[PDB]
Amino acid sequence: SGISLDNSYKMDYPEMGLCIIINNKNFHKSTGMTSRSGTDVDAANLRETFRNLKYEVRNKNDLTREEIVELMRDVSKEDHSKRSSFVCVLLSHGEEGIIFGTNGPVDLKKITNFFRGDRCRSLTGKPKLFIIQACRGTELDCGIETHKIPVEADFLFAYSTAPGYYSWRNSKDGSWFIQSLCAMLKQYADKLEFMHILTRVNRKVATEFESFSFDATFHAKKQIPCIVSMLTKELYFYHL
Amino acid sequence: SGISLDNSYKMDYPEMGLCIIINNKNFHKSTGMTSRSGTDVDAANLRETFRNLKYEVRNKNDLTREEIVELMRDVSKEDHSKRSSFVCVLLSHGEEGIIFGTNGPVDLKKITNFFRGDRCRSLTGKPKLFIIQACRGTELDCGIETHKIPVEADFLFAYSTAPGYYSWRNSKDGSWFIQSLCAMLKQYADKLEFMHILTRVNRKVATEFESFSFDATFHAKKQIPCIVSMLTKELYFYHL
Amino acid sequence: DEVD
Amino acid sequence: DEVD
């Protein structure tokens, strides 16, 4: 045939793949962690957004750390041969490298390891996307007035906030990042490559949001999400 | 005039900006760190590559941790009003969040803080690129057979390797990442957006390189670079 | 507005 | 081949 190019992930398998959404709102009292008001808005938006991208969406609410681990183990052991990609959305409390089950923390590394090129072979060479609405620390942004492929390859982490920083959630509108992510997927998924979509998300979050708090420490703060790509190809959600 | 779009950084200022290259090859004996054979190949390639992108390139060799800090402080205090962007290339030993001066470590955070939106105002809203050839840990990849804008916004970190992992340098060809980065900038800088160039770099490194060592622990290993973007716009090195 |  |  004519000359071929290898710049873009094959996204025309029979299925787009799984979108696993882990929505942690209510935490065991013993943990001392607050309820995450507004997260259901996020979970609902995410479900609809990925539904229209033709992902097989599975929502799971209020999972323990043990339940998160076993869910990810089990999902990694499914046959993904007929699926183009894998998406996992985590919505919870967190710290750098860590997300919280209802009863305690899970290392992000433990979660993603199940999907390593060598440990989940039906996803080898396919984009594995991890979208994470969770704190990565306690810093606040004051803003300023204007043999073959690596086992860690083909992962993308779309973090809601910069390393070390709090991430902002609005109890009525949902989180800044998830709001903006869904809006930009809705508007551009049939147009832009995914990194270019994620860049629009960065700018929306950075420009359009600023915290209001009665507490001076947490008032007038800003947020910039953080795209971390080990993808080896461009990712378009559409095909021919 | 006609309708306008705000999707791409303005790269048609009188100057592209500085490209600061810090090439650390020889380390104080007391540190116990090895010489980084091949790094001069990297420094030379980087100089030429960024020279053709019209960056004002400044190469500095074998800087102490004190010298790195004062250089970055001073560069951040220059007037960048007429410059489109800022680039800093770090070539050294490292660990997660850390790079080495000849006589000891510097926190990466200390270095980038000088260029925060609120601390370097002539670069506010302009892309600040940090390209880093250095280890981020000691893991090896065995591979598998096939008020206004956030102060942390508008930064891009192009890491040579994944979080926690060693980064590979060839004593004769130079580092895998810098080799591939220069090649892809040479070939695509007049064509692709920067993230799309960095993705080609990921794939080149991931597919075309594998370590050879007499030591089984370090033999047959692979590497995937790590793009970390807080950019808010697309970045093309060319303009109208 | 709250933090996660 | 060496590590950094």
* CATH number of the domain enclosing A40: 3.40.50.1460
- Other beta carbons within 10 angstroms of residue B65's beta carbon come to 17
Judging contacts by C-beta atoms under 8 Å, the chain C residues touching residue A35 are: none
Which tokens belong to A3?
């000359």
Question: Contact at 8 Å (CB) between B140 and B99?
Answer: no
> Is there a contact between A186 and A49 (Cβ–Cβ < 8 Å)?
yes
Two tokens at B236? 């093309």
Residue found by looking up tokens 């080799």 in the block? B179
Contact D2 B169 (CB under 8 A): yes
Residue A141 pairs in a beta bridge with A222
Asked how this structure was determined, the answer is: X-ray
Considering only CA atoms, give the Rg of chain B: 18
Domain count, chain A: 1
Give the max Cα distance, chain A.
Answer: 66
Q: Which helix (H) or strand (E) holds A194?
A: helix A194-208
Site of tokens 């192009």? B158
Which of B74, B55, B59 is CA-nearest to residue B23? B59
d(CA B106, CA B96): 11
D2 to chain B nearest CA, in Å? 5
Can you name the residues that pair with B131 across neighbouring β-strands?
B89, B158
d(CA B61, CA B24): 6
Q: Report the residue of A122, A195, A201, A207 to disrupt the B interface, i.e. the one with the largest count of B CBs within 10 Å.
A: A195
Contact flag B195-A229 (C-beta cutoff 8 Å): yes
CA distances from A113 to A16, A151, A153, A231, B216 (A): 21, 9, 12, 16, 23
- Contact between A162 and A168 (Cβ < 8 Å): no
DSSP B232: S
D4:B211 CB<8 A: no
A199 within 8 A of A130, measured Cβ to Cβ: no
The token pair at B5 is 């779009």
Measuring CA to CA, which residue among B177, B200, B176, B179 is closest to residue B188?
B200
Q: Of D4, A234, A152, which is closest to residue B162 (Cα–Cα)?
A: A152
Tokens of B21: 């290259």
Contact A175 C4 (CB under 8 A): yes
Please, are residues B167 and A150 in contact by the beta-carbon 8 Å criterion? no
DSSP B33: P
Chain breaks in chain A (C to N over 2.5 A) after: 146
Assess whether chains B and D touch, using the rule of 3 or more C-beta pairs within 8 angstroms.
yes
State residue B202 phi and psi, 5-degree precision.
-50, -45
Q: How many helices, marked H, and strands, marked E, lie in chain A?
A: 5, 13
The structure tokens 């620390």 sit at A137
**Torsion angles phi and psi, residue B10, rounded to 5:** -70, 110
Residue B25 domain boundaries: 1-240
Q: How many CB pairs under 8 A join A and C?
A: 35
D2-3 and A104-107: which strand pairing? unpaired
- Picking from B108, B114, B116, B123, the residue whose alpha carbon sits closest to that of residue B16 is B123
Q: Six-digit token pair at B219?
A: 């033999």
The verdict on a CB contact (< 8 Å) between A167 and C2 is no
Instruction: Kindly state the tokens that stand for A220.
Output: 């007038």
> If you count residue pairs, one on B and one on D, with CB atoms under 8 Å apart, how many are there?
35
Resolution in A: 1.9
| Beta-ladder partners of A137 | A164
- Tokens for A179, please give them: 């709001």
Phi, psi (degrees; rounded to nearest 5) at B81: -50, -40
Cα–chain center distance at B40: 15
A143 with A219: CB under 8 angstroms?
no
**A147 labelled catalytic:** no
